[PDB]
Design a protein around this motif. Structure first.
Motif, PDB file in Angstrom:
ATOM      1  N   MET A   6       0.835  -1.177   0.000  1.00  0.00           N
ATOM      2  CA  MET A   6       0.000   0.000   0.000  1.00  0.00           C
ATOM      3  C   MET A   6       0.868   1.224   0.000  1.00  0.00           C
ATOM      4  O   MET A   6       1.792   1.305   0.810  1.00  0.00           O
ATOM      5  CB  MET A   6      -0.790  -0.012   1.306  1.00  0.00           C
ATOM      6  N   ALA A   7       0.577   2.185  -0.875  1.00  0.00           N
ATOM      7  CA  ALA A   7       1.301   3.436  -0.861  1.00  0.00           C
ATOM      8  C   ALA A   7       0.458   4.474  -0.097  1.00  0.00           C
ATOM      9  O   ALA A   7      -0.737   4.283   0.035  1.00  0.00           O
ATOM     10  CB  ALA A   7       1.567   3.905  -2.279  1.00  0.00           C
ATOM     11  N   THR A 304      -4.346   6.144   9.734  1.00  0.00           N
ATOM     12  CA  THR A 304      -4.704   6.895   8.527  1.00  0.00           C
ATOM     13  C   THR A 304      -3.753   8.075   8.335  1.00  0.00           C
ATOM     14  O   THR A 304      -4.159   9.131   7.845  1.00  0.00           O
ATOM     15  CB  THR A 304      -6.166   7.369   8.569  1.00  0.00           C
TER      16      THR A 304
ATOM     17  N   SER B  10      -4.527   9.106  -6.153  1.00  0.00           N
ATOM     18  CA  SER B  10      -5.776   9.081  -5.395  1.00  0.00           C
ATOM     19  C   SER B  10      -6.360  10.431  -5.012  1.00  0.00           C
ATOM     20  O   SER B  10      -7.431  10.459  -4.412  1.00  0.00           O
ATOM     21  CB  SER B  10      -5.611   8.237  -4.140  1.00  0.00           C
ATOM     22  N   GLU B  14      -9.678  11.231  -2.729  1.00  0.00           N
ATOM     23  CA  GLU B  14      -9.494  11.683  -1.354  1.00  0.00           C
ATOM     24  C   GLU B  14     -10.443  12.813  -1.014  1.00  0.00           C
ATOM     25  O   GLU B  14     -11.052  12.783   0.049  1.00  0.00           O
ATOM     26  CB  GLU B  14      -8.061  12.157  -1.132  1.00  0.00           C
ATOM     27  N   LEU B 115      -8.757   3.051  -2.563  1.00  0.00           N
ATOM     28  CA  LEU B 115      -8.309   4.030  -1.586  1.00  0.00           C
ATOM     29  C   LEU B 115      -8.904   3.560  -0.286  1.00  0.00           C
ATOM     30  O   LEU B 115     -10.064   3.837  -0.011  1.00  0.00           O
ATOM     31  CB  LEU B 115      -8.780   5.442  -1.939  1.00  0.00           C
ATOM     32  N   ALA B 116      -8.163   2.731   0.446  1.00  0.00           N
ATOM     33  CA  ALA B 116      -8.567   2.156   1.734  1.00  0.00           C
ATOM     34  C   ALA B 116      -8.728   3.286   2.718  1.00  0.00           C
ATOM     35  O   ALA B 116      -7.862   4.157   2.786  1.00  0.00           O
ATOM     36  CB  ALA B 116      -7.494   1.180   2.229  1.00  0.00           C
ATOM     37  N   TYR B 118     -10.402   4.806   6.758  1.00  0.00           N
ATOM     38  CA  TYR B 118     -10.849   4.559   8.133  1.00  0.00           C
ATOM     39  C   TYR B 118     -11.344   5.901   8.665  1.00  0.00           C
ATOM     40  O   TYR B 118     -10.583   6.871   8.642  1.00  0.00           O
ATOM     41  CB  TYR B 118      -9.709   3.978   9.028  1.00  0.00           C
ATOM     42  N   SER B 121     -11.117   8.941   6.482  1.00  0.00           N
ATOM     43  CA  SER B 121      -9.740   9.303   6.188  1.00  0.00           C
ATOM     44  C   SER B 121      -8.962   8.284   5.354  1.00  0.00           C
ATOM     45  O   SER B 121      -8.753   7.140   5.762  1.00  0.00           O
ATOM     46  CB  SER B 121      -8.980   9.588   7.469  1.00  0.00           C
ATOM     47  N   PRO B 122      -8.446   8.735   4.202  1.00  0.00           N
ATOM     48  CA  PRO B 122      -7.676   7.838   3.350  1.00  0.00           C
ATOM     49  C   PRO B 122      -6.393   7.463   4.032  1.00  0.00           C
ATOM     50  O   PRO B 122      -5.709   8.325   4.589  1.00  0.00           O
ATOM     51  CB  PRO B 122      -7.449   8.667   2.084  1.00  0.00           C
ATOM     52  N   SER B 123      -6.106   6.167   4.055  1.00  0.00           N
ATOM     53  CA  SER B 123      -4.914   5.670   4.718  1.00  0.00           C
ATOM     54  C   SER B 123      -3.893   5.092   3.740  1.00  0.00           C
ATOM     55  O   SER B 123      -2.689   5.140   4.001  1.00  0.00           O
ATOM     56  CB  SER B 123      -5.308   4.670   5.803  1.00  0.00           C
ATOM     57  N   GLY B 124      -4.374   4.534   2.640  1.00  0.00           N
ATOM     58  CA  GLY B 124      -3.500   3.947   1.643  1.00  0.00           C
ATOM     59  C   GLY B 124      -4.159   3.669   0.312  1.00  0.00           C
ATOM     60  O   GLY B 124      -5.382   3.559   0.208  1.00  0.00           O
ATOM     61  N   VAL B 125      -3.336   3.562  -0.717  1.00  0.00           N
ATOM     62  CA  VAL B 125      -3.794   3.277  -2.049  1.00  0.00           C
ATOM     63  C   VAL B 125      -3.024   2.098  -2.599  1.00  0.00           C
ATOM     64  O   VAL B 125      -1.841   1.960  -2.350  1.00  0.00           O
ATOM     65  CB  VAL B 125      -3.741   4.531  -2.964  1.00  0.00           C
TER      66      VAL B 125
END
Ligand SMILES: COc1ccnc(NC(=O)Cc2ccc3ccccc3c2)c1
Ligand SMILES: COc1ccnc(NC(=O)Cc2ccc3ccccc3c2)c1
Lengths: 304, 304
Positions: A6-7, A304, B10, B14, B115-116, B118, B121-125
């Motif tokens: 994951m980036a 996050t 992303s 976002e 775009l994971a 939580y 809030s975006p934490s990772g792509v």
């Protein structure tokens, strides 16, 4: 559950990407405050790359010779300087999309997200790691120089890398945001062979802990080892030596699974000596070393 | 050169992520125009998940029961409806960060960026692919439902997926942005075993062409095959059948390398029957099927 390379979200960084042209050469630049950062090889013609004298080349360049474009609006260059291997172009406008930032020089073995760019336009984001031989295995084409590597601490972007070079082996070379190359690489079109690329042992251990967290426990055995015994096997397979500090860093992962660090080292020793036997761990058929223990803890918690 | 699982930038996505709370359940929502999209299971308590009657549950919910938060500002819900497995919350404000968008239902075998998130809030792509069994192998924890899958066509975001479920095997299930699940998955806490996950043959061929472009040519042999002969070997290894349309899609890659599609199928047949023999292709020890031929062409050309 689930485990992926994951980036960090690239939004904050996208707002900083600009196009820098000098002569017939166009590449990417990082626009922060009223400064645009870019690899100094933007001033070279393809012949100049063979044996460049950047200070001499830069004498023939004026502010008006550097074209800086943020999207489709042209930025005015009111000053230019060279800092190591990056040119800093002072513009008359501060980037209103400048996020809270820091320039960090990361350690080998550490990870970062790359926002690969072409003509100041972000095209893709992916995760990388600084190899112990100071190269990165990215994905860059012509027009990608000036693409940046970065981490995000909640809301602060820590820029760590700028792409400058492709090496004969296919790996990449770049500098921190102060223009100093990671490793012994120079921005010259000369064959610069990389050293032995060793495995970031601690990262493999963190990813084996992520695999346990995920349900992949086939590789866990009834054996243990000591740091010294492990390093005898690690040295043979070009693995980085494991220290007590690495063992301590693995703390939250070792506690989360209840598996001691040395017990996991023993499983790594058996994977090294016996291979995977056609099996996979987190969908990979080889030992992944590009997840630092921080990436693993982050992904297996909810940050996050 | 270089080859990486690259996700789209992303940034545009976002700006659309919000937090939706209903009771003690908080998850992510997609804020586009004056609508917030979210998995309808936000209304369920953990007991309700066992055998939920969404229409009955939703009767007890009013607009004021859905808390929508974009960053730290609260959004006012002036309407709510259920469309299949997604709740659409009409808010009194249009998202000023709404990009040009489309809702697409992707085909199995196609890829997309996730775009994971939580708490909005975006934490990772990271990049994913819709498996032929309609599951995805993502990376999701509790609080991640409502995370979205998407592609970008220059400046238009094509939302294709919304995360709703984790399956017993560790894979994930979700819906298109119209609330229809991909596959036979239902938003109920019941064991829903996935079908046989077959290999997206065309994607493996595209990634073997990317490997040739990159300099990894060890697997290329002096043999050829026919579509029918290839499919006899592909069926045995749970590989998707190869059609003339797949061969045509591989056109730009076959032309770029000069290697016929059927010649590459022959190399794939030998990799399937003989394995990798400890070797790697693009740093992978297994056959990668999560790069569609479009991803490969894009990465090996210069698209942004
Ligand atoms: C603007 O100039 C750039 C940009 C990005 N990468 C480069 N890289 C090089 O020139 C280094 C190199 C690579 C591969 C070789 C292969 C064979 C013989 C010499 C080689 C030298 C130059
Ligand atoms: C809000 O509810 C959610 C959110 C995300 N995923 C779920 N998933 C499930 O309930 C399905 C499931 C998974 C694994 C099992 C394992 C064993 C026995 C049954 C199982 C059922 C529910």
């Amino acid at each position: 559950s689930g485990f992926r390379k994951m980036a960090f979200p690239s939004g904050k960084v996208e707002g900083c990407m600009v196009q820098v042209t000098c002569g017939t050469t166009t590449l990417n630049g990082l626009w922060l405050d009223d400064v645009v950062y870019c690899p100094r090889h933007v001033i070279c013609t393809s012949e100049d790359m063979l044996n460049p004298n950047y200070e001499d080349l830069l004498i023939r360049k004026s502010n008006h010779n550097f074209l800086v474009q943020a999207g489709n609006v042209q930025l005015r260059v009111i000053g230019h300087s060279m800092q190591n291997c990056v040119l800093k172009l002072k513009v008359d406008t501060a980037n209103p999309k400048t996020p809270k930032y820091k320039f960090v020089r990361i350690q080998p073995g550490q990870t970062f997200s790359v926002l690969a760019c072409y003509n100041g336009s972000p095209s893709g984001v992916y995760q990388c790691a600084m190899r112990p031989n100071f190269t990165i295995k990215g994905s860059f084409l012509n027009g990608s120089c000036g693409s940046v590597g970065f981490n995000i601490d909640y809301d602060c972007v820590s820029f760590c890398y700028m792409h400058h070079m492709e090496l004969p082996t296919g790996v990449h070379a770049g500098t921190d945001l102060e223009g100093n190359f990671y490793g012994p690489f120079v921005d010259r079109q000369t064959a610069q062979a990389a050293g032995t690329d060793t495995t970031i042992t601690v990262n493999v251990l963190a990813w084996l802990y992520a695999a346990v967290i995920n349900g992949d426990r086939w590789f866990l055995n009834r054996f243990t080892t000591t740091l010294n015994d492990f390093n005898l096997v690690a040295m043979k397979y070009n693995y980085e030596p494991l220290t007590q500090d690495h063992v301590d860093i693995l703390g939250p992962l070792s506690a989360q699974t209840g598996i001691a660090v040395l017990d996991m080292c023993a499983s790594l020793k058996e994977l090294l000596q016996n291979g995977m036997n056609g099996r996979t761990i987190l969908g990979s058929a080889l030992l992944e070393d590009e997840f630092t223990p921080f990436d693993v803890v982050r992904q297996c918690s909810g940050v996050t």
